[PDB]
Design a binder for this molecule. Structure first.
Ligand SMILES: Cc1cc2c(cc1C)N(C[C@H](O)[C@H](O)[C@H](O)COP(=O)(O)OP(=O)(O)OC[C@H]1O[C@@H](n3cnc4c(N)ncnc43)[C@H](O)[C@@H]1O)c1[nH]c(=O)[nH]c(=O)c1N2C=O
Ligand SMILES: [Mg+2]
Ligand SMILES: [Mg+2]
Length: 641
């Protein structure tokens, strides 16, 4: 269905009210069931109208005109649903043509720190709600962790680059709006060992299968057996993995031992049967009244011994057969060979890439707490660089670039934000406002020697959440060539590293369809460490790997190279949050919580990828967090109309 799909596209249940809807419509949820289904149909249809054409504003008027004929008479209820959906950024979000323009007089002043996707999304909302909005951005560009390299015909994304499925993803709407073409990522990812040799199909699938079983087993240990605490310390995913690996190695040693015992037993039995057979032979030997009765007597005596000997020879045959059968079918000598382990490490590296951190830092219990909210559909890349999104969202907004915020003061009567110019650190600005929306990356909030001061320091419940949460790292080397020397039918191929410690080093190479660019990813422990290597040396290390795979003559010098260093970047201090051991999804809720000065009204608000528990560490999460806070701020200052 269309209306059912609209709800789904909006991350809502089509056939029931959410608790947030319950709060805003207490009369509906406590009323007759018939009216609840009217509510849901109006909601689902209003969403559909928006999603069918998100390039224009969906007004209350137009919703009412397009509703069919009992519902177009629910005038008041339709207005209430429209208002709710609009306020919460489920319709009329992103970039679209306004039908009713903004009042020239603006109500309330909001300073937004950061113009990444969350700041930009929030700003458009607050602006379209008729508030006065200024964004202060430290960089000489918008977009933050959406960072596109553009030079000549080369386009490459240094930050976010993947749209993780369209089904339920608000980036589907934003992409439609900016005419951003999306292409599917082909799944085939052949692996090459450190020497350049392809990993054959059979091996690849065996090791991948083991990877999945190992992960499944940690999930079992955590959520079925509750193995989440050791030595009064929360257990990490990495820690649990090594425990599961040790158990597998033990199992292999056990079955090996049992086999050796069966062999030794059978060897013993043979030896002992040989002995008595040797002695029976010696008894046959030393067996060498009428003459004729003596002849008969020796005959029956001797054939009694030969019948005895045949019985034993039969058992000799059965034992030698059993022995040969055991020596032919031993079980595995090892759980994983050195080579097998290295390949398994590639899969671990890949997981460290997705989570932006070594596995030993991830919470066993909570690392994947957000899996339940993953979107449906194939994962996609952007045709002409992801920066099209924040650039488009910036249109019409008041953005102060090269303006690094240093102090935030907030009181029961208002707020002040002090910033400095980053080209001339002498000149300092003071910005007055009724509300501050903080979109500083978690890494910036963690910074020791702090980058930004809060007068009233942030309360302990906030700072302890900041401290508990992980902020990861992940980097890329962009290699721009004259020609495609790799297979154009693969988007991805893997480099199996030499050690466990260095498994994340240039472990994955990425290409977009028919562009002469390779992206080499640096993940896990290698990510932070490799930042201390100059571009030339790291590019050199890339070329060496590529030469080992494609041939030392098939690989030309790159025309252009770029290398991200997200941890060293002072405006990021890493790539994105991860659920650290000792933290949980709750810390994301805590990060989202506004601060009241000390009934004083809330003054300091928080958005960004680290403040949304269901969608952290993503562009859509950043976007949704922005819509959320805009909603809450407008409710505070313009009333929950
Ligand atoms: C290498 C890499 C890869 C991926 C992703 C990320 C990365 C890095 N991420 C995360 C998102 O980029 C991020 O969550 C979001 O952009 C944050 O979006 P966000 O939560 O809005 O954070 P931001 O850092 O973009 O915005 C904060 C802004 O604040 C500015 N700022 C900082 N200090 C300031 C100050 N003192 N004063 C004023 N402004 C200041 C800073 O320059 C920046 O513009 C992905 N996202 C996604 O969906 N698909 C992906 O492929 C990926 N990707 C990998 O997997
Ligand atoms: Mg197993
Ligand atoms: Mg090493």
């Amino acid at each position: 269905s269309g209306v059912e799909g609209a709800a789904f596209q909006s991350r809502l249940p089509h056939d029931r009210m959410t608790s947030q809807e319950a709060a805003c419509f207490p009369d509906i949820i406590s009323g007759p069931q018939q009216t609840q289904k009217v509510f849901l149909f109006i909601r689902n249809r209003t969403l559909q109208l928006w999603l069918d054409n998100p390039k224009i504003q969906l007004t209350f008027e137009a919703t009412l005109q397009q509703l069919e004929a009992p519902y177009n008479s629910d005038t008041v209820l339709v207005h209430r649903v429209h208002s709710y959906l609009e306020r919460h950024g489920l319709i009329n979000f992103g970039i679209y043509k306004r039908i009713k323009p903004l009042p020239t007089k603006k109500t309330g002043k909001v300073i937004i720190i950061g113009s990444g996707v969350s700041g930009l999304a929030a700003a458009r909302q607050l602006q379209s709600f008729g508030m006065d909005v200024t964004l202060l951005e430290a960089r000489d560009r918008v977009g933050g962790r959406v960072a596109t390299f553009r030079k000549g015909n080369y386009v490459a994304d240094l930050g976010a680059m993947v749209v993780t499925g369209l089904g339920g993803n608000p980036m589907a709407v934003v992409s439609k709006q900016v005419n951003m073409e999306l292409a599917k990522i082909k799944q085939k990812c052949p692996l090459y060992e450190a020497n350049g040799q392809a990993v054959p199909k059979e091996k690849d699938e065996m090791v991948e299968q083991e990877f999945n079983r190992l992960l499944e087993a940690t999930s079992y240990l955590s959520h079925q057996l509750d193995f989440n605490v050791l030595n009064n310390k929360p257990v990490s995913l990495g820690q649990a993995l090594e425990v599961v690996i040790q158990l597998q190695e033990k199992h292999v040693k056990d079955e090996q031992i049992e086999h050796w015992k069966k062999i030794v037993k059978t060897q013993e039995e043979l030896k002992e049967l040989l002995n008595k057979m040797v002695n029976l032979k010696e008894k046959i030997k030393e067996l060498h009244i009428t003459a004729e009765f003596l002849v008969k007597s020796k005959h029956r005596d001797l054939t009694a011994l030969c019948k005895e000997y045949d019985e034993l020879a039969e058992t000799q045959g059965k034992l030698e057969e059993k022995l040969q059968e055991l020596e032919a079918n031993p079980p595995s000598d090892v759980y994983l060979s050195s080579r097998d382990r290295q390949i398994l490490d590639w899969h671990f590296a890949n997981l460290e890439f997705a989570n932006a951190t070594p596995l030993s830092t991830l919470s066993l219990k909570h690392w994947d707490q957000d899996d339940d909210f993953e979107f449906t559909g194939s994962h996609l890349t952007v045709r002409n660089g992801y920066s099209c999104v924040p650039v488009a969202l910036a249109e019409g907004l008041d953005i102060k670039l090269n303006t690094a915020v240093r102090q935030v003061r907030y009181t029961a009567s208002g707020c002040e934000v002090i910033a400095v110019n980053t080209r001339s650190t002498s000149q300092t600005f003071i910005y007055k406002c009724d509300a501050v929306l903080c979109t500083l990356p978690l890494g910036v909030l963690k910074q020791q020697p702090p980058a930004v001061q809060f007068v009233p320091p942030l309360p302990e419940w906030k700072t302890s959440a900041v401290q508990r949460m992980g902020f990861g790292n992940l980097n890329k080397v962009v290699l721009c060539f004259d020609r495609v020397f790799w297979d154009p039918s693969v988007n991805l191929f893997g480099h199996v590293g030499s050690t466990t410690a260095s498994r994340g080093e240039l472990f994955l190479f990425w290409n977009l369809y028919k562009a002469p660019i390779l992206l080499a990813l640096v993940a896990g422990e290698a990510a932070g460490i490799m930042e201390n290597i100059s571009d030339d040396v790291i590019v050199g290390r890339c070329l060496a790997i590529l030469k080992g795979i494609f041939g030392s003559s098939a690989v030309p010098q790159p025309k252009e190279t770029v290398v991200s260093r997200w941890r060293a970047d002072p405006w990021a201090r890493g790539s994105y949050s991860y659920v650290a051991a000792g933290s949980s999804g709750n810390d994301y809720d805590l990060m989202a919580q506004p601060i009241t000065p000390g009934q004083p009204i809330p003054r300091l608000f928080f958005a960004g990828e680290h403040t949304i528990r269901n969608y952290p560490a993503t562009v859509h999460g950043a976007l949704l967090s922005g819509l959320r806070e805009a909603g809450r701020i407008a409710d505070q200052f313009l009333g929950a109309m």
